Design a protein around this nucleic acid. Structure first.
Ligand SMILES: [K+]
Ligand SMILES: [K+]
Ligand SMILES: [Mg+2]
Ligand SMILES: [Mg+2]
Ligand SMILES: [Mg+2]
Ligand SMILES: [Mg+2]
Ligand SMILES: [Mg+2]
Ligand SMILES: [Mg+2]
Ligand SMILES: [Mg+2]
Ligand SMILES: [Mg+2]
Ligand SMILES: [Mg+2]
Ligand SMILES: [Mg+2]
Ligand SMILES: [Mg+2]
Ligand SMILES: [Mg+2]
Ligand SMILES: [Mg+2]
Ligand SMILES: [Mg+2]
Ligand SMILES: [Mg+2]
Ligand SMILES: [Mg+2]
Ligand SMILES: [Mg+2]
Lengths: 86, 137, 191, 118
RNA sequence: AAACUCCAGUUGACACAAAAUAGACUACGAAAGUGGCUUUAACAUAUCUGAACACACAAUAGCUAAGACCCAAACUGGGAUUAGAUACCCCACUAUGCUUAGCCCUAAACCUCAACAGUUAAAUCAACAAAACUGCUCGCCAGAACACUACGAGCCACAGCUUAAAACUCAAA
């Protein structure tokens, strides 16, 4: 309200391609967490519920990163069989 | 020169022009995309209103207002009244995640207006008023 | 609900009876010609009457549409007609307990004070066989609690082959209420 | 202790800006402060519009005053700055150069088991 | 549907309300709690253990008095749904959530892990939870239900809190 306008969350359109500009803006707002923030703010999430989801999200991210690391490590041996017939 | 998605900063010397007008002089299309309606107001750089259209003023009622085709129709209506007043290039400022968020912009284009930039001004309180309680569905 | 607002550019019918912003009758014309008028004069289209066989629409400005919409809401506030009569219904059993029948009787009373119609159905109970006249007694017990507040809209009638009776109760009309007060007063003078 | 006053002044001409600084440094001295230095950070556009004393501001003069004062002088100085109409925004912080930074060897790895366990 | 139509959109001015991102961090505090900024004061104990009641605290809700009031919101009112709907769904608005001064003293107040010290070798270990144990101390428990009840006593509590039985009943829980 007190800030300058047309700087925050502003994307310029190139060659009249408004679809690509809108996708870029939506990608920016998504990566910065504003889209999820807006949605969670439509109804009040109670503090005990916010902590539960934040705890669930943090444990799921760790579990997925740890499961990705394991598969990357165990995919080194996905090469062809060196001792076929034995 | 390479294309910059960052808008030109006022007071600096840019080479970009639209019909001989600088970015600071292009009129603004304000799109409020609500969950049950979409409102579009086109204003000049001096904040002079030029055109207003919403799904309700285009003859849509109740749940039909909260549709993309209703917002697209509202955009076409606002574009027509704005084009008569001399508007070609507009800066789009959309607030809200309603169904007419993108469709309202398409209608502005189909109505003869050229969008040079898109700005999101969806209100996000930094801590603000308590929203209504969750719904049991 | 039907709202007094701009119909828009897409008109439902093809042939449209049109009027002027000042009320001058422009006659019947095709919807394509009406849209051209709305743009040439910068006016909006409202629906004044739909009952007429030729659909009647009128051109109006946003200011006019507002004044009429304001006018109408000042009339309805002055004359708030209670349009809908709501038919509440209660399905009872012959062997219903007194505590349950007293609870449902208090509920029927509250519906009558709100000027609703109460359809009461009484069905034969489980493991219980009853004379159809005995089932009819419950109707007189329910209405006895409302001596001067309710009366049979439709008298008890056998339904489903006589398995279950039916009925409809209503609130007494103002004339019927003054008659009850009159009759009650005469008895007071006699006693 | 040693404090740092971050002072944003109303954009004024040189004579009125000097009168504001002198009047502000004398207020510190009147409250027992020992003023160490005065730094000009330059006039710039504010990061946002600031309303102060029934006026709207878009530019301001940024100044720093490094000084020593008793702990009781801070409360009284904050009150003085609130009444000076030529001050847009004034904040007194503990001087950052007093706090000594502790040495760091590096980023020790944290076991993932503790993350989910914690 | 009701509701509003001194309504809505842009722009400007604007709080005694609430504190995006950081925070994927795991810190501070006895616990309860604590996540905008600044400053002041400031986070007991050079052996441990040690209280339903002593001493001091203790979320939310609630009480008494005076204030603030954006938004949310029991109750209530209206709309709709329904066989009914004292609900779930929609709208409005109040107590209340805030401040100040007093109370009240409860929680699934829960890592559902008592404090301190020690061990990783024995048998690893009913099961699940959270690898299995030792020393030492305090608190507590002894079938279910009756019973977060009765009576007594204490309490700023008066439809309250704390402590807390018995009779009848069962062969389970
Ligand atoms: K914050
Ligand atoms: K727990
Ligand atoms: Mg019905
Ligand atoms: Mg001790
Ligand atoms: Mg204790
Ligand atoms: Mg004891
Ligand atoms: Mg206790
Ligand atoms: Mg408390
Ligand atoms: Mg309170
Ligand atoms: Mg409200
Ligand atoms: Mg109701
Ligand atoms: Mg209130
Ligand atoms: Mg506050
Ligand atoms: Mg807790
Ligand atoms: Mg202990
Ligand atoms: Mg027992
Ligand atoms: Mg209890
Ligand atoms: Mg008790
Ligand atoms: Mg007692």
């Amino acid at each position: 309200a007190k800030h300058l306008k047309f700087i925050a969350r502003t994307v310029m359109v190139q060659e009249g391609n408004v679809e690509s500009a809108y996708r870029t803006l939506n990608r920016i707002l998504t990566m910065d967490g504003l889209i999820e923030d807006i949605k969670h703010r439509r109804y009040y999430e109670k503090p005990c519920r916010r902590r539960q989801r934040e705890s669930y999200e943090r444990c799921r991210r760790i579990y997925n990163m740890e499961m990705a690391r394991k598969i990357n490590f165990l995919m080194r041996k996905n090469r062809a069989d060196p001792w076929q017939g034995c | 020169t390479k294309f910059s998605i960052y808008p030109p900063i006022p007071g600096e010397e840019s080479s970009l022009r639209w019909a001989g007008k600088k970015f600071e002089e292009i009129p603004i299309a304000h799109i409020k995309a609500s969950h049950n309606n979409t409102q579009i107001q086109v204003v000049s750089a001096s904040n002079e209103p030029l055109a207003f259209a919403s799904c309700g003023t285009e003859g849509f009622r109740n749940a039909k207002k909260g549709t993309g085709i209703a917002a697209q129709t509202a955009g076409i209506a606002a574009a027509a009244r704005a084009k008569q007043k001399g508007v070609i290039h507009i800066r789009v400022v959309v607030k809200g995640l309603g169904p007419g968020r993108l469709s309202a912009m398409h209608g502005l284009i189909m109505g003869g207006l050229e969008v040079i930039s898109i700005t999101d001004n969806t209100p996000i309180p930094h801590x603000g008023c308590r929203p209504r309680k969750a719904r049991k569905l | 609900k039907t709202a007094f607002s701009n119909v828009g550019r897409k008109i439902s019918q093809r042939v449209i009876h049109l009027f002027d912003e000042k009320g001058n009758d422009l006659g019947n014309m095709h919807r394509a010609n009406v849209i051209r008028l709305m743009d040439e004069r910068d006016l909006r289209l409202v629906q004044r009457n739909t009952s007429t066989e030729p659909a009647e629409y009128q051109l109006m400005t946003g200011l006019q549409i507002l004044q009429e919409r304001q006018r109408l809401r000042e009339m309805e506030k002055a004359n708030p007609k209670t349009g809908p009569t709501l038919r509440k219904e209660l399905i009872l059993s012959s062997n219903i307990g007194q505590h349950d029948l007293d609870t449902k009787t208090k509920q029927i009373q509250q519906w009558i004070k709100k000027k609703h119609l109460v359809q009461i159905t009484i069905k034969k109970g489980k493991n219980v066989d009853v004379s159809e006249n005995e089932m009819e007694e419950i109707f007189h017990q329910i209405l006895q609690t409302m001596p001067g507040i309710a009366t049979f809209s439709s008298r008890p009638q056998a339904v489903q082959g006589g398995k279950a009776l039916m009925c409809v109760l209503r609130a007494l009309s103002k004339n019927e209420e003054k008659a009850y007060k009159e009759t009650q007063e005469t008895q007071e003078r006699d006693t | 202790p040693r404090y740092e006053l971050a002072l944003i002044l109303k954009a004024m001409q040189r004579p009125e800006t000097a009168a504001t600084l002198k009047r502000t440094i004398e207020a510190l001295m009147d409250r027992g402060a020992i003023v160490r230095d005065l730094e000009n950070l330059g006039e710039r556009a504010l990061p946002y519009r600031i309303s102060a004393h029934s006026q709207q501001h878009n530019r301001g003069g940024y100044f720093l005053v490094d000084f020593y004062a008793p702990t009781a002088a801070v409360e009284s100085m904050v009150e003085h700055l609130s009444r000076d109409i030529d001050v847009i925004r004034g904040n007194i912080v503990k001087h950052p150069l007093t706090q000594e930074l502790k040495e760091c060897e590096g980023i020790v790895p944290v076991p993932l088991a503790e993350k989910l366990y914690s």
